[PDB]
From a paper:
We developed an affinity-grid method employing monodispersed single particle streptavidin on a lipid monolayer to enhance particle absorption on the grid surface and alleviate sample exposure to the air-water interface. Here we generated streptavidin affinity grids with monodispersed single particle streptavidin (mspSA) on lipid monolayers, which allowed for high-resolution structure determination of challenging samples. Affinity grids could alleviate both issues by enriching the particles on to the grid and keeping them away from the AWI. Taken together, we developed mspSA affinity method which enabled the structure determination of archaea MCM and in complex with dsDNA, HIV-1 CA Di-hexamer and ScPol II EC, while providing essential insights into DNA replication initiation.
RNA polymerase II is the enzyme responsible for synthesizing all messenger RNAs in eukaryotic cells and constitutes the core component of the transcription machinery. We added biotin tags to 5′-end of both template and non-template DNA strands for the attachment and enrichment of the complex on mspSA affinity grids. This preparation method resulted in particles exhibiting evenly distributed 2D projection views. In contrast, most particles on the holey carbon grid tended to adopt the same view, consistent with previous studies. A 2.98 Å structure was determined for the sample on the mspSA affinity grid. However, due to the severe angular distribution problem, we were unable to obtain a 3D reconstruction for the sample on the holey carbon grid with the same number of particles.
Numbering used by the authors:
A (entry chain J): 1 to 65
B (entry chain K): 1 to 114
C (entry chain C): 3 to 265
D (entry chain B): 981 to 1223
E (entry chain B): 491 to 502, 509 to 539
F (entry chain A): 1287 to 1445
G (entry chain H): 2 to 64, 76 to 146
H (entry chain F): 72 to 154
The structure:
Amino acid sequence: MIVPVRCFSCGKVVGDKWESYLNLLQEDELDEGTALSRLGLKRYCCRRMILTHVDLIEKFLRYNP
Amino acid sequence: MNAPDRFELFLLGEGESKLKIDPDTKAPNAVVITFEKEDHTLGNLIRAELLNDRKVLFAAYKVEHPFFARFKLRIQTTEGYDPKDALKNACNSIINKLGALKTNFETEWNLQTL
Amino acid sequence: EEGPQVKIREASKDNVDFILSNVDLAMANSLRRVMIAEIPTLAIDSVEVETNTTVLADEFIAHRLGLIPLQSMDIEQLEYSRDCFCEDHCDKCSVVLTLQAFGESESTTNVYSKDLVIVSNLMGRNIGHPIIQDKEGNGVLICKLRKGQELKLTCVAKKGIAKEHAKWGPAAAIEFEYDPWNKLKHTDYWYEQDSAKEWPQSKNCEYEDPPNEGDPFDYKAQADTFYMNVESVGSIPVDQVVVRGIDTLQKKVASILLALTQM
Amino acid sequence: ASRHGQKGTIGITYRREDMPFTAEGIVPDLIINPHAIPSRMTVAHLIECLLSKVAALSGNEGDASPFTDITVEGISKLLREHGYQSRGFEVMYNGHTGKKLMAQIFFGPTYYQRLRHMVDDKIHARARGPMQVLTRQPVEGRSRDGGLRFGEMERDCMIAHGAASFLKERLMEASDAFRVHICGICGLMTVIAKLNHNQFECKGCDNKIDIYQIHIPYAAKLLFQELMAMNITPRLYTDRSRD
Amino acid sequence: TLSHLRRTNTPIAKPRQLHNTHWGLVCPAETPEGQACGLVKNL
Amino acid sequence: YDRKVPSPTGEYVKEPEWVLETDGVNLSEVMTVPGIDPTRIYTNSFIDIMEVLGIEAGRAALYKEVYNVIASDGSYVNYRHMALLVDVMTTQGGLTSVTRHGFNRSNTGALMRCSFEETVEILFEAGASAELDDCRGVSENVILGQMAPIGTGAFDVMI
Amino acid sequence: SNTLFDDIFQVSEVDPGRYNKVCRIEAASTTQDQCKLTLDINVELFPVAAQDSLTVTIASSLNTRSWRPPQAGDRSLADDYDYVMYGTAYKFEEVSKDLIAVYYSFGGLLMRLEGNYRNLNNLKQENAYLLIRR
Amino acid sequence: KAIPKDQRATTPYMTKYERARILGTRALQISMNAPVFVDLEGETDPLRIAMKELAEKKIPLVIRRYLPDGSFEDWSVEELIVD
Amino acid sequence: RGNLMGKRVDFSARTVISGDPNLELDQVGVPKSIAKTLTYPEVVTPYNIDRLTQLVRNGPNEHPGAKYVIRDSGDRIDLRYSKRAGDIQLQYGWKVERHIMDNDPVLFNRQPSLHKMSMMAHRVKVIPYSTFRLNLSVTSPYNADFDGDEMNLHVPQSEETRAELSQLCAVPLQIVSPQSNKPCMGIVQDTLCGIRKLTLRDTFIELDQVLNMLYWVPDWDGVIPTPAIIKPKPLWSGKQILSVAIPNGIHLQRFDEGTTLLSPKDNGMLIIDGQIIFGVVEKKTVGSSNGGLIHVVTREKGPQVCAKLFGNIQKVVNFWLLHNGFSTGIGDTIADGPTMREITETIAEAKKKVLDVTKEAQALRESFEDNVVRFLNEARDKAGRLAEVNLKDLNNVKQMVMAGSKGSFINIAQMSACVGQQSVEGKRIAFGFVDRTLPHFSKDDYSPESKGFVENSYLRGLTPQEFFFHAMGGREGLIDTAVKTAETGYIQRRLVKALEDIMVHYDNTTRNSLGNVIQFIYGEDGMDAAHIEKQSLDTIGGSDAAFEKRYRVDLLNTDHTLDPSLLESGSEILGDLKLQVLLDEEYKQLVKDRKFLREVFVDGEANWPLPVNIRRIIQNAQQTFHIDHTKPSDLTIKDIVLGVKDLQENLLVLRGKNEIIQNAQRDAVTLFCCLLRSRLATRRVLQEYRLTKQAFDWVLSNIEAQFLRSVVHPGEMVGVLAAQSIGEPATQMTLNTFHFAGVASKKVTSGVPRLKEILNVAKNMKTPSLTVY
Amino acid sequence: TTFTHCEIHPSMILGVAASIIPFPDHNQSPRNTYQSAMGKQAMGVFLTNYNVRMDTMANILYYPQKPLGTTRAMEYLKFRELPAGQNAIVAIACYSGY
RNA sequence: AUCGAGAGG
Ligand SMILES: Nc1ncnc2c1ncn2[C@@H]1O[C@H](COP(=O)(O)OP(=O)(O)OP(=O)(O)O)[C@@H](O)[C@H]1O
Ligand SMILES: [Mg+2]
Ligand SMILES: [Zn+2]
Ligand SMILES: [Zn+2]
Ligand SMILES: [Zn+2]
């Protein structure tokens, strides 16, 4: 919904690597794999945490209440 | 709803003892010790050191159910050797080895400083 | 020393790759299980929500807060809640934090773990600080606020181990390997046409001699050398993680010995 | 359940220490039985797991469209480049003793879904709660604190075992069991049993001496009363006239 | 929600079958199995 | 077909024979055709076996037809169950079907017969005919909530 | 307490059939004519090739109770051999007028021995310690 | 009517139905404060005392086996053979 | 039908079930919340005052406790509102509705209850989870999975009812089924897939793991077995430490096609005195097999022993598999390259062969699609066999097929070689359109690809046409699960109602509720269906010369003479006209039995179900009384000949001083007497089975004892048991067929509607036929 | 040679629920039907405005994740924006018999 | 209560 804190499979913190991931994707024009490797996410259990995530919070932030 | 408390894995009860020692009549000089609030972390480690004793004829642990945090350890030693003494010797050997490993790791980390 | 030996081949602030020697498999496995499970850490435990206009549930935010890594270098000085003659909150058994956020900006306002503020008296202890490892200086993204939305939380962080909850575990992942070559024949490799060309050669194969070609099977050999790589979430330094793991295992063994002596 | 009809329920929840681990520290989020697939023939599950492993490692998005030219031989040639066994197998170590396993375990990411069915919304137990007003039997439904139906097939199964007291107890003590007074002459449930006075009367045949009591299900009593209301006399007699 | 919005019911064996003419008009796989198999279809 | 015939040396040999199979049954006329074996002709229509050979041959044919269906894939069911099923369908001198027409029209108590099918009609007929129910069946003791004469309740225990 | 059958066998064929650590060897006695052996052997612990010579001895005892791990100090028996197995005899067949055959099962590995009268001390006892020397 | 003690043509072995009914009846009677005929020692569960009594053949009950025609045969529990 | 024959009951619970390898066969795991809701009224006695009053003071909150205290008058003291201490001290005759505790008999059921094994008595074990945890071997009678299934628990509320539950409906008492006289419970799933990998010649275990596995056996006697290999390294074979679970005194010999005393391929089975001599343990041995280990341990010893054996095997095998592991992946379905092209050829020519067949088509009838469908099925089967043969032994799906835990040959063929031919309603895909099956084919096209032949495997993937054809074929597997299940449940209900009142009376006759005699002896022999094994009659078969050499003894001529080495007095046997008179009468009896059995069994089949297993008793006598073959016997001819004759008069099924009952007795035990004389002839007891006097007496005593245990117990509800045993195979045979999704099973399509004819004596037969010779 | 039409794509014969299955042609048809039935019981974000609706029995997964293996039809079904599952790490192993 | 829908083994 917001950002998957930690990692179910292991426990590594990945909640502080979302804005950096987006900046790498957009500002640095890198692809998903290179951006994920440049963030220090080596294990594919952590890699899927940021690779496959839907940031629905923004949509929930578009309502008046 | 029916899930047990997660602090029941490492907290003793009201009248619950960490070790329950019962003589075993299946084999001579054998004993079964039930360890409460324990896991495979400290059952395999004790069994491995018990098997390293030349005066131990049998040593094996088991957890009867994963729901409950306890395990039974059967120890059978050579006649004239108290299995409690075997357990004490195994624990002392584990403590000495762990202390040596701590000292060696501290020395290696100190040398590792760039 | 005399028994176990260590060789730190890689050391960073988050990973330690070392090589244990002169140990049995049981000791190494017990050490890694202790490092995963039974080394104490400080983490948020009780969240009181005073104001929550956000689009996130109170318990959602509480669960996210509980997973935030907090500094726990001096965790050994605090007391357990069960063993403290105190109440739900105190100074020698818990750390009190306060989060106050308001969406004043027109755009989305991010609430980070950096915004957490320690309120209780630390009494000169290096404990209870949100951990910042991002280069931007921001911690973990706790939440987001649109405009006029407010978050007011009082958090109580208590000492605990990873057995009770995974939020208290400071070991992210502990790589553990032994016998890179299949000398001991503890594994029967699955193959289609060739077993040596279909299975990738592990890196640790560079540290052992290949098993020759036709030498007879060595049935008297046991596992002695273990290649380990310990990570840390950040609450406890990696060297402190491994040292406290060894200390906790030693404490468990000594507690059993003491119980036996008392009986 | 996965996206292939591979449904299941949690049987145990091991912690991270007790779970098998690979040489790089990955611990499965879920363990499924190998015996599930060979009869279900859900090869798409394994292909999806392999493709998901490749996609997670490479960072791309796996294309699982049905009628494409993507083949398992093409996915395997991509997984091997990343440094893994081409068929998805991975050497995993035991979580208890830390020893290698002789069999390499199929390991990888798979998309799983949580279904609406949970035990806390299915568990039920009844200890003589509310009952119906018509048949005086246990009410129906978990939400109504009702009991479970001991249907005819269950009755036949209990007959096959040759247990006669359990069947009666399930039919009398567990439900109904309303005693009725029977006249010794007409045999109908007409006796005006005025208790607290020790007087029983059966107008219509002037029988105040031959009265018995029988323990029958309330459903049986209501059946007999409905038969009486339909101009039929189900006369219950205690003794046997013809052997 | 989408499946409900694109459902079809036949008020009624041969009817509970996947006919050859359902190619591309009715989903061959999506159908209930709660005694309404084949009678309820999805576009 | 192949038939196991005892050879003159005592062994069993699969000798071959020619067996004709027809589409349609005229047993009472085919059996008298010269050149065939009248003692080995068989029909899958067990009704025609009873009308030509008797109820006992009808019982044997009924058991054979039941066996050919229960034990066709290779499944095995003990002979006792099929034998009892065939016997129940034949103790009245004719093929008594397992249907409300065949076995529900017996002299059994009306409480057992009304629990299967045609409940109200059976009860009406019992009331009109004043049928007496001996309460020896299982259904009759189930409706009355009594210990049926089933195993463990098929005897009395005194002191 | 003593040996029951000591002989020397020359191996003629080694069969690795469907098993990676077990091979079924066939051997013929070097000294006496009609004496053959068909034995399953753990190749990993004791590799056996073709045309090898093996001294086989039926110890039946090493001089009932729970087995005790070997300890320093004692010698017992099976100290000059290379491969020792313990199993139960389960069949005594009469091959011919002057031939007998005994079957042993060392935990699942089967052995068949054939002879004329040298197989006289072999009785149907679990006491059988197959000793093999290179 | 009633078959005499002789001319009884029924199995002297106790059927499982008879054994189970006897055990249940004895267990129910014992739980209702009936005189136990055997030294119960440590046993407290009434079914256990019933089994102990059956093993020593001290249950004073009797089975009335009913023939289809209505006649019956009385077999003592002590008389019956239990296997 | 809705309120009297079936009611809603109190003291019942329903919950999702899950497996538990650490639970006994007869145990069930009850959640704590359910155990605190369901209650049992216990009468206070001098033997339980303290426990009952402590439960009362516990209250209805703590699990060991009570919810009510019923007084003698009838008033109930609720322990949650009213006071529960003080003068609450109990008095004799009061009832205290306690919470359910450990070791309580509870009925346990799963719908639909197609047979009596779907409803069994289990033993309560309180657990901390909302699941009805149960053993993995008891799931077969229930037909239960752990993927959402829910089950029901009924609590008896009396002392008689608990005894009835624990003495008739107990799980150990239901191990052997009376339907097919074979066990209905066996080792299943993982334990079956490990039992064969633990019991290979290639499996060896070191001391440290052997100690743990030995400790995991609760009945282990504390004696370490001597390792199979001693000097180079102490190693225990898997059969060595698996045999610790097998009880002492169990003998079982199995010989497959490749089985020899040396069993090169480890075929067959040989267990001597509870020790596995050779053979890989698989479904044929430790499964629900006709003559496997479970049947022997159940028939012999006790069912409880067998129940203990289930747990002893499961714990060891599951512990071994925990530290070994077992998986399954894509590479298990990939066949070798060179072995794939052959498969393609194995298809292609067959397809072209079908082409030739259609040339015969041009010049109701059918006899073409029928033959073409058969050819395509044979092509699929031979391709699957070619694929399975060339699969390596370490292949994980092959190991599951070898063990029999799950999967089969058809699964291998469909996942690796080809899916095959898709058929709906018993016929291949019909022309829904005009002269074609799909709009992508030309009209008048009869090629196999055009009418539903899937040439591809699941690994390769199905083309859109083959995908649609497979969907069409597999939908039929779901229709007969929701539509045709009602047509086989009505059959079973009619069968149950027709045979509801049938039972065995105390005069050993089978009667209706009116007293009408259905059968004069149940099953024409009066034997319980659970005490019967398939046994061979040696007299019926073989040559005349072979039979003579088998059973003919002549004490006067050298033609057929007893070896004096066999019998101690075998030196003075020669001559002795009285002994020849006693010895040729038995040969005449054997000849009469041979001709009688050849009359009864026209085809000459020798293997028939009979009550008492005699080979097993012979083996038990040989092992128990240690017999040396190199020693003369101790049996006089007058003892072997007259012993069997005296035994034949002790096989009493019917009792009566009249002549009708005596003739019925002679007729009843007649074929069993033929078997007995075939197995206990003088030559057999002297030469083949070198028995002694003590061994012979023991054999006779055991035969007499076990025969008297197989007689049906008066009170059996035969009709309900027979009705369930007929409709249950049909009901479970249907409600399946989604497991294969396209294969042609005529017995679910044309099998059950034939049962609808016989039961209703259908006047018109779908296809009448007359067979003339 | 007498083709009169061509199909846009063969995979457009499936429905809404069956278009979520990855590699449905490598799967037994009853399994596809089972998933189509179970695809409507998967828990996820059913609507973005779930916090405004007063509807009975609303279930929302904490962290919905887009599938790692996606079909090309998922773009038009909005499954990558309102997913109903998570990418677990599954191991196929007979670990402990549970 | 009635009716109906949908859904699980
Ligand atoms: N219409 C029905 N009538 C009676 N019983 C049914 C019916 N539908 C399902 N069942 C019960 O549910 C079980 C079906 O299980 P399920 O639907 O899970 O399929 P399965 O055979 O377990 O295979 P899989 O789990 O692979 O689909 C049967 O054993 C049966 O007892
Ligand atoms: Mg439905
Ligand atoms: Zn991770
Ligand atoms: Zn405090
Ligand atoms: Zn009256």
